[PDB]
Amino acid sequence: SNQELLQLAVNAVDDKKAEQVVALNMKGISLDFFLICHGNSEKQVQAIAHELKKVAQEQGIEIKRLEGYEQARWVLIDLGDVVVHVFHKDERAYYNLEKLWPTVELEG
Amino acid sequence: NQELLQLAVNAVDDKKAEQVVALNMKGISLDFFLICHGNSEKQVQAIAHELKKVAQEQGIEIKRLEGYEQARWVLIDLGDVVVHVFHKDERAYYNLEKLWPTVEL
């Protein structure tokens, strides 16, 4: 998709104070954008994931996937053209997210 | 194709890598992801090295190799095929579900 869903996800995630928000242009890589951020506690991680869900249902966007919400260590919210990854500051795969997957200059 | 994949499966097999699983990334990424694990950091490195050794014999170019020293999660980018050698105790290895069609062997 475009910055419309991405900005939609960035804001939602921003309203809940998600830290280190990073977008990835998954463009040439996957079959568009991957939004990454993290919470400092399992309660904060779920708050973020929920605001994204709440906002997604307001704008009428179909959530294709949502996994790891209960555990709140690595919540994946598939919004289609955009996929959000909300990690817990202590999640290890969150620091190895380098191996996996080109960023996107949000402010622009 | 199965040429590089079988090449990687064998290398990883010579070192006794356990729970070898191939993933068809067709229609997902821009070929094959291969996963397996070692029971110790020494075994994990043995596997990663056999892959490196085999890759240099066949003359295939290793694009990436990360986490070898730590031997908790070694990534060997062989191009069309990317191998992930985990340590049986690595957590991201049990959450590899979230991330992302299992190829037969």
Ligand SMILES: [Mn+2]
């Ligand atoms: Mn698209």
Ligand SMILES: [Mn+2]
């Ligand atoms: Mn509507």
Ligand SMILES: [Mn+2]
């Ligand atoms: Mn917990």
Ligand SMILES: [Mn+2]
């Ligand atoms: Mn160690």
